[PDB]
Amino acid sequence: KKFIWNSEKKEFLGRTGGSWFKILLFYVIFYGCLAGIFIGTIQVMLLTISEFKPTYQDRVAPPGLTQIPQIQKTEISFRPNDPKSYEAYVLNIVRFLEKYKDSAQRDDMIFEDCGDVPSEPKERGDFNHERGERKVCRFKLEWLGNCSGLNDETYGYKEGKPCIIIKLNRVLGFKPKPPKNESLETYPVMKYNPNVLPVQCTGKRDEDKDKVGNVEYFGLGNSPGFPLQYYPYYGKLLQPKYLQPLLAVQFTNLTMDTEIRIECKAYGENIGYSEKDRFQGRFDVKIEVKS
């Protein structure tokens, strides 16, 4: 029962060489046939998948709202006096903003100028290869003001006025719809541009609202949000080198030595929120500037 490794009968583990060869050959052929069947079914399925548009989008829409720097636990904690406490933040920001430099948008067959004011969505055709690659609207770093990184290379972290870059998750064919007739919320918001998807950053709790200082919005135009001429997005196949619009938020009068909970929220008819997904249409960020 426990002594089968070798035997007089030339039986390795119970079977002879011929029996082992036959059983192993059977399993090799069987698994080869199974692998062939699996590959064939996968290819047949992939034949039904469009290369320009996903079959379903109900799980990716409405899009999420994210921010740069890519922080670990929605926490930004640094000391302005110590240049190594925000070096990771500044490096993350500069790595993100490398493709937004003017020198990287020079090809006129790829990029184009789509105005210096917010505009309506640009229809570039249908989701196919009728006209090859679509052109990409340019986005200038100068729109980001003091968070542009062209004059201050630390983005306000050395001064104690940190910058965050807000972005909306890309969805193919999604055209944001701004709120109708200024009927979402009230603040000193220039929410009168029908070509901007408004974004606002407020204190999370009533304690936080009194400790957040002035919030500065930097982007295209005077309305804080995303200009609509960058939509719809046609995918990485039709529109490689696509640049999504950016909104820069700088906190210039934060209370020091305290952890501040901040909620940034986007508003729109097709922009939704959830209690399960803390990043859908909004996000939370905690910022502590230590003296």
Added chain:
Amino acid sequence: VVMDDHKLTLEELSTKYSVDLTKGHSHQRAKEILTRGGPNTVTPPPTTPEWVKFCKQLFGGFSLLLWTGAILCFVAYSIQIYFNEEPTKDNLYLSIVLSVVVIVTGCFSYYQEAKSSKIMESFKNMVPQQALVIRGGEKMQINVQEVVLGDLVEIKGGDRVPADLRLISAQGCKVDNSSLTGESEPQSRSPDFTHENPLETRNICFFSTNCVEGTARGIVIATGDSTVMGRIASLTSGLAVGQTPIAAEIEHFIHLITVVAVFLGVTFFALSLLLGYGWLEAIIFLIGIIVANVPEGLLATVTVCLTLTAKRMARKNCLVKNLEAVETLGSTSTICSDKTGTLTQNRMTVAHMWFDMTVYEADTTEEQTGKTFTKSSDTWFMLARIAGLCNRADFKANQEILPIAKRATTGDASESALLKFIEQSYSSVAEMREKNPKVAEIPFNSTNKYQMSIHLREDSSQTHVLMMKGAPERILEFCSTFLLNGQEYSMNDEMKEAFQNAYLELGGLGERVLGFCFLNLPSSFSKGFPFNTDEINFPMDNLCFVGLISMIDPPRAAVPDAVSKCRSAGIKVIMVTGDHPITAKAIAKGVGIISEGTETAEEVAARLKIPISKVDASAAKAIVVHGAELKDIQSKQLDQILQNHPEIVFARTSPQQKLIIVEGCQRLGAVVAVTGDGVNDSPALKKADIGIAMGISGSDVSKQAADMILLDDNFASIVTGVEEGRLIFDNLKKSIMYTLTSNIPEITPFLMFIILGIPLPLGTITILCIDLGTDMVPAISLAYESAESDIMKRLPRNPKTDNLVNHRLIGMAYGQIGMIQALAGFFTYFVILAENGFRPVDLLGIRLHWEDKYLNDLEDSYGQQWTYEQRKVVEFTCQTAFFVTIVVVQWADLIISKTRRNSLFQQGMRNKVLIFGILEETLLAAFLSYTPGMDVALRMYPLKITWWLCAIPYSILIFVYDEIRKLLIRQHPDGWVERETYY
């Protein structure tokens, strides 16, 4: 203490116990001996409390495997809690679920066995037994427990013998020793040494026997545990329980499963270390992989299948005292059966008649389901009237529901047999005796050897008829005329030797013969003639002979057919009895234990006229072994006897020798069943792999020792038990195959998560919903499959070689069908992820980004950016679809698991429980996917219509593959396909 008291003189008996055999023990000596030597009670077998029985159910092979799985899961959860950040509760859920499954299954099994035990306890009844002791010079009705050694005891008819007695005075005493010695007929008792063996001498009476007639006085020689019954009880109590055959099969299956699980876990632990995970993560992987192989739902499935078989058997008055006993008869290679009370009715019954120069065979069956005899001659009417009127016996109180054979009477066994035979053949005896009132009685006695009687004739003659019955050679001298066809002829030379040619024939069969006569008195006596027995007021000569009646203890009606079926099933049937060899051989020939035409060596020698050594050992297929020989038989000689003879009869065997025979049969590698009823069968019943006791004729100790009870004493239930055991073995194979198939699609998702770094295709919640959910009813429904061929035409399985679970089943479930099921789930997983934007190539190595809770812009194949919760919802939808796909491909697995050799088109779809199980599992899968709130309670999400259709080609592939495999098995018996895949 029957060692020498029978061969002791009447003076040494008085000296030994310091008592005088006319006055008895002093009234204080009895109390002194009672308080110095204990009471007169056999110690009962030890009683186990209820909680110990429940804890015995909680542990055991399968339960210990699930306990180990739960402990490993708890250890893994503890490691994750101590070292990891925000661990999930998968392992805690698994620990709790495994523990709950074990506890519930134990509760179910305990409840079933407690129900059987309660039925047995209800059957057992206590009535205060009291004895008659000559203490203080007068009669006392003391309790049976207060009888002491040396006490002087008087026993009358109908009294249980209070203890082992050495008889000193007796007057026509007869006792029934059938339960203790296996002798059906009552044994005469005399106060004299007759045989060397205490069990054969006529001057010893034993405890737990019944005095039938007469009266006797004796001295108590053994009390309590020192009695013959008490020593048998101690011998029974000193025996180990033993492991049932199905428990060994479950143990082997657990060994195989443990080996497979450990091998997989260690190989993937090494792979995880090579891939650069870390020792702690590798340990977690190892524990998870090992636990995933444990089939926690199969324990409940096996318990339910055993319970269903037990209830099916209980429907036929066959009580099993544990669930494991429900299978043992299917694995039985040898049946060792007692004769008296087990194969035989243990009741004196009319067997033959001789009148009109003809021998008639009576119907000895209990229900009268046999062959009748000629009842047209008026000689038969005269014989019936005589045998029914000169009887002195009568039924007891109420037995009208019972058949006539099973009814109780009041009188001698011969008188009761004659009464029953006349009642069930001629007419009611009560009406006959009302129409023929008695006048003179003249009771029977031994010296006269006849029973005369006078009755008022029914034919309205106003006169009387004398009726005489007695010994044939005794009543023949009184009758000078016989009755041939109702014609009162005279004594011829022919009708004085045909009487001696039939008496020597009916007496040569071991039967008890009787003669009957009548006179039809002259009319001079009118009606109220004074009939005085003390004188000759009535003629007692020239009687008219009628016929002879013989009686013998017959077999039970169902016994011969049951023995024939068991021998057709390849089972060896051995008779082990404590009765005389002639009776044992006659019964063995009558029931088919000794087949027609087979001969013994002592008969071949007498036929060929050669010495027993010269007898060839090829025509003596039958042997009769005397118990005296077994005292000088070694293990080697016993093995030779048991191996060299197909047909064996053991006669005059003690309980110890029956135990020795059972042990010798087991030592040769056989699974042994023992059927017995008396106290002399208890050690063999306990030592047997399966012990079967008669419910009605059995004794309390034998019913305690047995694993199975025939409540109606129906021997046809043994054939049913063999068939049900074989069928339950086959259906357990099918159910285990079905359950083990789904293991592969449940662990391969985690294996590919570890090796390929893809999002997890199947979750713990969905795995639990498969094992304890959609798979339970389909697995149970395979217990209702009918046999694919004639199972009773098979030979008994070889326990050493034929296993319930072997490598063929593992190769079929793990290697072939489970792999196809696993590929079906991965196909659906990939189609869903590709339709949501993640092409299959882009999912390789995405684990670190996919699982990052703070990466909320993960990019798909189209450039879309996903949040962590969004992609987690997609993953949970993929897991729900994987679960549904496993459900769909289990339809085909259930269809192909219905048969092991036959095609579906040969066996059909007559199993309604299987169809219901398919519908129920489909509805359960649909309910968990589309019910609102199931996305929060579980992580289960609604599915698209097309996502249900992804597993259809794989299910069809499974069906076609299994159909072709079984076709090849059928076409090529003993071929390569059958040797590798036929599990």
